[PDB]
Amino acid sequence: SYTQSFGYTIPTEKDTLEIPQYQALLAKKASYMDDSQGKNTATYMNTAAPKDQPETITFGVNKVDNVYKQSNVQNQTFYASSSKGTKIRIDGKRIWRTQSTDVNTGLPVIVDCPLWTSFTLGFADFTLVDDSARKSTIEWMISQLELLKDDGVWSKLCSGVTRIYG
């Protein structure tokens, strides 16, 4: 009889996030661009956005030779039979565009500033890993953002608070 946990019982209490269906729209309107960003990385243009103001998401998957060196596993005996791991990465680059017509000339004045986001998940490639394990850790990150509170972990990071909890 064996048990495999992250180390603590998953909290019963659940924060509910009402997230807009961005992905659905993007999936409908995503057109394949050439994979400039990497060899095993495929870049995608979102056609729903305008041609002169594009939003692009690039997917990548890179295998990592030794997972344990990066990670903090206390004792070396616990190391699994093979330390080869797989790592996934979602990069997205979108544009927050401000535009207003010039008073002097009807030509609009456009100034768009860029915003970008990146999500990464690396996991030791073994059979001791479940999609249960991986989806839990994804949810762990998302919860760690504290998105429900307007002035929360994410706003403090944006506002520069490194030492969040003390």
Added chain:
Amino acid sequence: SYTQSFGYTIPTEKDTLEIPQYQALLAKKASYMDDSQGKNTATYMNTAAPKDQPETITFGVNKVDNVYKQSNVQNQTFYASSSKGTKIRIDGKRIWRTQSTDVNTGLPVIVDCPLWTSFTLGFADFTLVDDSARKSTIEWMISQLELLKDDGVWSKLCSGVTRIYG
């Protein structure tokens, strides 16, 4: 009167994610430790985890001299007055532990393999960026995961599908 948008109207339709309150438990049990990782990066240990199986989350914030260069903006004339921006990064390292008594000796054999996740948000540091403008992008990534569907975007990345949408 200036009008600012990401380039398309935010979708009305909303995917609801019931995410466990990992962050709440971590925030309660989080303890600060030396910033070996960086001069601006603060590393935190989750005390709720077992003493020989620690889960650790490290927060970081770094200014970027020129946001426009990295990102794809079609026309130079739209660059804002100052391209200096700010970038935030949450790194986490947890440990999926498989432990069994199934050995000749009574003693248990413990094999844990590492999992790590990372979330990053970089935004042009300028007046025009709203917290509405930033919060939308975080939600944008999270939606892009397609977490509702069990075999979705995230599982295809984990399984290795670079070219998700075709």
Added chain:
Amino acid sequence: SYTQSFGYTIPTEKDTLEIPQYQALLAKKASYMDDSQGKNTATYMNTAAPKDQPETITFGVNKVDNVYKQSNVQNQTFYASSSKGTKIRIDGKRIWRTQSTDVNTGLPVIVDCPLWTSFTLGFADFTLVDDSARKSTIEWMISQLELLKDDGVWSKLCSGVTRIYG
């Protein structure tokens, strides 16, 4: 009695396109230009357009050595003395001009952008090639544009959608 079709009976249903008589005005005001643009072609300039904003159309016709190599047709059992076709090509280059007057100085401000359109029809030189054959395939292309719908095939292409139908 021979049944000759394109592989499927022509659809009874008909989309009606109310197309402005651009060609009538151009044909009235078209003036010959020396065929710098092609060796076996003829380039024409539309005098109706203002002199600082010219619109030009170029007609060309080139015969093709072997029709069958390009096309995907089960190779068939009928003697052909030669299998060479003729190909026609209409090229057009026009200008979309945005012009205003600077409020400060009565001086007008002009900014124009180019658009170009090309239509091509190649057909095997054979007795059996009918006016019906060619005009049907011209109509075939025009329908393929889905011009009636605002959010149609054409706008998806101009959006950047490679995989239009599936």
Added chain:
Amino acid sequence: SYTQSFGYTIPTEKDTLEIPQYQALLAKKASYMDDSQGKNTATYMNTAAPKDQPETITFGVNKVDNVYKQSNVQNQTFYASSSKGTKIRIDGKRIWRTQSTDVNTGLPVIVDCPLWTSFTLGFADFTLVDDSARKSTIEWMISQLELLKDDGVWSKLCSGVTRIYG
């Protein structure tokens, strides 16, 4: 108040084209096929046509680094802020089949000659370009065919007349 036109007021008079709904049938019966033509190009097979007489339409979209170089605009002043452009291309390959059955031998006599067509529209990527501008120039080409007259522009090209208007 800024006014933008193609240089001459759009002709009021309208040629009406009754075009069969080829596109509707194809869209119902279209099936994906290899993106062989280009990485930004998706090729489709029309299932309505018989398996041994296939008809195929391939869509493509390629960015153009500098639109102004190809086109003719009289003064460098008028050049828009970014000369980047986008170009769309519809390619189709169909088969005109003529068939009867031999009296002497039950075997059908089938002779089919191929015909192909291509449409292209390239335009500057700039906030001034409206889908109004694009759709107008699409109609401009279509009108330029002079489809209404049986012996018109298109049939003169097909017969081999380079210098159409004089």
Added chain:
Amino acid sequence: SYTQSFGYTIPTEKDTLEIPQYQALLAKKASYMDDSQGKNTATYMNTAAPKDQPETITFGVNKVDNVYKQSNVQNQTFYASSSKGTKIRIDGKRIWRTQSTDVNTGLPVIVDCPLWTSFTLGFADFTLVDDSARKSTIEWMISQLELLKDDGVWSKLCSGVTRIYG
């Protein structure tokens, strides 16, 4: 009235094969992979299989310049414009994984042997080639396996019997 057959009347008697719906599950869970494996092919990955044990299938289609050269057919008296033919190819690579837990240690011991399969069908591009002709020859191979018998043609080939029937 033409009699067209394979040289002998199709046998009335029918072997019934109860084949699991491997294809249904794979088509549901199949995801695209960049065609490293072929220049004109498409390699797909089955997401149903666990991530550390991938199962992949690759479809390819290549035309053939002359079919009659390799095949043994009395050269015959019917005009052919060309004599070229299409050839299709399905390649699959899967993994037979045997896994247990070493009881001397606690660590699991996993050993998986690779298996692969390939099906190919090449046919002359002609009008007279029926779907009937091709589906028949596909069934012809499948029958030739003698799959019903445990000690059949297929097991003899697996055991190493070149000269199966004598």
Added chain:
Amino acid sequence: SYTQSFGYTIPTEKDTLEIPQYQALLAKKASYMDDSQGKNTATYMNTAAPKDQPETITFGVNKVDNVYKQSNVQNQTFYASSSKGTKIRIDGKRIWRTQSTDVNTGLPVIVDCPLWTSFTLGFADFTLVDDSARKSTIEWMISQLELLKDDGVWSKLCSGVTRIYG
């Protein structure tokens, strides 16, 4: 307790294929022929087909030095003690003959075009590989043909569809 599977539980649902007993007739009427194709390859001639319209099936078996190199297994740990493997191959060449008799001349008109098919199954030589494993993967390929649907995987390949599932 050892568990060995292909990675996913075999689908309960079963497609039933009513396949003519081609193999029974060929086995009755099969005659030996030169082993020209390979020294480990025996070619047979089917006598049931007429002398002037022959059908021939050639069986082959070749050892493969290293199976793992061709195949994709994620970790070197999982490699079996010996990577030696054995590969079997059935090649068939048949001829599709359409014939009628000319009314004008008693001489029959005969036009036959050729078809050929090939099936291949390679597997690691190891005590773990069961006839269960090998027969299952044979069935896996057969299912992958989607023979039941008249317009299915096989006919799409035949028509030229490289990218079948997307």
